[PDB]
Amino acid sequence: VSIWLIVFGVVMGVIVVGIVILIFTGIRDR
Amino acid sequence: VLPNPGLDARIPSLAELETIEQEEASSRPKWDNKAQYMLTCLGFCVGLGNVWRFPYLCQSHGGGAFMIPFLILLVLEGIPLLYLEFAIGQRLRRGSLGVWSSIHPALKGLGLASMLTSFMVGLYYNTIISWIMWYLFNSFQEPLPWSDCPLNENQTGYVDECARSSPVDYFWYRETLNISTSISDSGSIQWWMLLCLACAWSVLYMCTIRGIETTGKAVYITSTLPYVVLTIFLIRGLTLKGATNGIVFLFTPNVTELAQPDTWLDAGAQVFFSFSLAFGGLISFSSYNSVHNNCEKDSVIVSIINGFTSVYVAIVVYSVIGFRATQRYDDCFSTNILTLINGFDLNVTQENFVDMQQRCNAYAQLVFQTCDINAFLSEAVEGTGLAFIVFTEAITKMPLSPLWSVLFFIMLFCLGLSSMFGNMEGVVVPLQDLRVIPPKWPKEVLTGLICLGTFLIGFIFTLNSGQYWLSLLDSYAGSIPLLIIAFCEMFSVVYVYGVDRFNKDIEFMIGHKPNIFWQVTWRVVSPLLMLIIFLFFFVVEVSQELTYSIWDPGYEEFPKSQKISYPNWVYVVVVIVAGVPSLTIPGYAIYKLIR
Ligand SMILES: *[C@@H]1O[C@H](CO)[C@@H](O[C@@H]2O[C@H](CO)[C@@H](O)[C@H](O)[C@H]2NC(C)=O)[C@H](O)[C@H]1NC(C)=O
Ligand SMILES: *[C@@H]1O[C@H](CO)[C@@H](O)[C@H](O)[C@H]1NC(C)=O
Ligand SMILES: CCNC(=O)CCc1cccc(Br)c1
Structure with missing residues (x-):
């Protein structure tokens, strides 16, 4: 188990969440 | 001052500028606060x-030998061009590409070159x-992964490379880079480097999705953390033993270097980097202010x-350098001490050494490593x-090494x-002006197409040879291109658009013609300074030979540096990285005079 991989996993996951949230938020803007 | 026929009906009239603010609430974006604009300029x-x-x-x-020339050029060539850019963006209500198109139709190369340079510098800065976030990720372990050396397959001895060099050097060149011996020897795409690259461009997209709107809310933490953390690193910096020995070292400047054109060139090109000038993302940022905003006061505060x-x-920086240098000095006198004691069986201090060895003198058999x-x-x-070899090592000799690691690599992120937010604005906006995409597409698309296209181009730096590329790219990316662009902005606002016209519009916006300081810096001093630094570029290029440092372990003096000459194909890479952007300014100007 690489600690960098766990840290990356969390961070990359959190970013994706934001990304999709922002896309829909803009789509919601009508 | 030169022929510019038909400048009105290509530029908003001052009479219309009052009537272009309340109507243009839609179709052009707006700063939520004044602070949200000042943060975004400071951040960049x-x-x-x-x-x-x-x-x-x-x-x-x-x-001091660099800081002196720096602070001289920060006031004489920096402050002027930072004022000029904020003013010309707020007046022409266009980004960098629109401003040089409106000022003069054949002056398109300026805006284009600004977009190319902004693209190029942002490519290797991500x-x-x-690299920064790789270290950040590897910064959550009581023994920092660069604190110790790996062992042999037998585990009877430390890895050879890591022994000849340092745990820190090994983690950088082997564990992180997996560096090859030359730019020629380019291996596969280092996978762990690709994940970190993906992570970098991705969080960039997450913060520059709708543009200044979404980035404006990013620049609160992003423009404030570096400071809060930089102050924590001063209180810790100055408690380190060798600090105030290295602080004293920066204040006692080398003057021999003050007589080198190299020190002045690097100081020159750093003014255009420290002030984000000639990238053209500041023009675009000032183009979203009120027409009656004090752009003379904002420039002085930011500067x-x-x-x-x-x-x-x-x-x-010199706190930590001093601390490190003291450590290496003490660990050297200690060894010089151990040799004498282990050859004469003696009771010896950093003080009673030169007399001690003298009286002691087998002495010939002993070897003392001279060091000051x-x-x-x-x-x-x-x-x-300085981040991956000097700071990362000093952190390992500081209690709460992991904290000191995470704080330092978050403030660098x-x-x-x-920095990337302003670099993204200098490529996205000039694309929206060129109307490269169809207007129907939202902002997220163009942004995303740029975030994925470059991320793909960023694979050249995940190779084994990937570090040499980032080296030479930078060397020719932020040099002449910025110098030229920066000089042409000063020239085309004063001698093509007219400084006298430029003085009247500022007077419309702030209620006063600028101080004679501005007048002398804009008409004569800054252009003359930018010309002296532009020659100094060619003065340092001729004498020096095209070379670079390699990390060959098989090299006799593996620890010692190895400066080999680049292959003869590299001049194809150099002529484009520097020439293409710098020639778009004459190139388009000629094309427009024959169309
Ligand atoms: C200031 O810079 C000069 C130039 O690098 C230094 O002079 C050098 O010193 C080293 C060590 O004695 C010599 O090996 C070089 O050949 C010298 N270079 C030249 C061009 O003379 C000088 O020592 C520096 N001064 C300080 C205080 O660091
Ligand atoms: C480093 O590069 C060499 C040469 O391509 C390769 O053989 C080796 O497997 C690489 N190491 C890692 C960890 O990727
Ligand atoms: C990762 C590339 N960066 C560097 O080498 C130096 C950065 C750096 C070192 C110390 C203090 C600060 Br602020 C920045």
């Missing part, structure tokens, strides 16, 4: 200078953010903070080494990210 100025380049040249020229943070960064603190302080790490 403090993050593009101090994320890497500034702290490097300070330590690469000895400190790799440095990837005063930019000059102050340079000195505040050089202090936090001055040589340790003078040691210059090349490349990105923030600094790199806020």
Whole structure:
């Protein structure tokens, strides 16, 4: 188990969440 | 001053500028606050200078020998061009590409070159953010992964490379880079480097999705953390033993270097980096202010903070350099001590040594490694080494090493990210003006197409040869192109658009013609300074031979540097990285005079 991989996993996951949230938020803007 | 026939009906009239503000609420974006604009300028100025380049040249020229020429050129060529850019963006209500099109139709190369340079510098600056976040990720372990050496397959001895060099050098060149011997020898795409690259461009997209709207809310944490953390690193910096030995070392400047055109050139090109000038993302940012905003006062506030943070960064850097140099000095006198004691069986201090060995003298059999603190302080790490080789090692000799690791690499991320926001604005906006995409497409698309296209181009830096590329690219990316662009902006606003016209519009916006300071800096001094630094570029290029440092372990003096000449194909890479952007300014100008 690489600690960098766990840290990356969390961070990359959190970013994706934001990304999709922002896309829909803009789509919601009508 | 030169022929510019038909300048009105290509530029908003001052009479219309009052009537172009309340109507243009839709179709052009708007700063939520005044503070949200000042943060976004500071972020782009403090993050593009101090994320890497500034702290490097300070330590690469000895400190005061670089800071002196810097603060001279920060006031004479910096402040003027930062005022000029904020003013011309707020008046012409266009981004960098629109401003040089409106001013003069054949002056398109300026805006285009600004977009190319902004693209190019942002391409390899997001790799440095990837490298920064690699370390950040590897910064959550009581024994920092660069604190110790790996063992042999037999585990009877430490790895050879890691033994000849340092645990820190090994983690950088082997565990992180997996560096090859030459730019020629380009292996596969280092996978763990690709993940970090993906992570970097991705968080960039997440913060520049709708543009200044979404980035404006990013620049609160991003433009403030670097500071809060830079101050924590001063209180810790100055408690370190060797600090105030290295601080004293930057304040006692080398004057021999003050007589080198090299020190002045690097100081020159750093003004355009520390002030985010000639990238054209500041013009676009001032183009979203009120027409009656004090753009003379904003320029002076931003500049005063930019000059102050340079000195505040050089202090936090020389604290740690001093601390490190003291450590290496003591560990050398201690060894010089151990040799004498282990050859004569003696009771010996850092004081009673030269007399001690004298009376003692088998003496010939003993070897004493001569060393003085001055040589340790003078040691210059090349490349990105000040973060990955000097700070990362000093952190391992500081209790709460992991905290000190995470704080230092979050403040370097923030600094790199806020730099990318302004670099993204200098490529996205000039594309929206060119109408490259169909208008129907939202902002997220164009942004995303740019975020994925470059991320793909960023694979050249995940190779084994990937570090040499980022080296030479930078060397020719932020040099002449910025110098030329920066000079042409000063020339085309004063001698093509007219300084006298430029003085009347500012008077419309702030209620006063600027001080004679501005007049002398804009008409005569800054263009003359930018010409002297533009020659100095060619004066240092001719004498020096095209070479670079390689990390060959099989090399006899593997620890010692190895400066080999680049292959003869590399001049194809050099002529494009520097020539293409610099020639778009004459190139388009000629094309428009024959169309
Ligand atoms: C200031 O810079 C000069 C130039 O690098 C230094 O002079 C050098 O010193 C080293 C060590 O004695 C010599 O090996 C070089 O050949 C010298 N270079 C030149 C061009 O003379 C000088 O020592 C520096 N001064 C300080 C205080 O660091
Ligand atoms: C480093 O590069 C060499 C040459 O391509 C390769 O053989 C080796 O497997 C690489 N190491 C890693 C960890 O990727
Ligand atoms: C990762 C590339 N960056 C560097 O090499 C130097 C950065 C750096 C070192 C120390 C203080 C500050 Br602020 C910035």
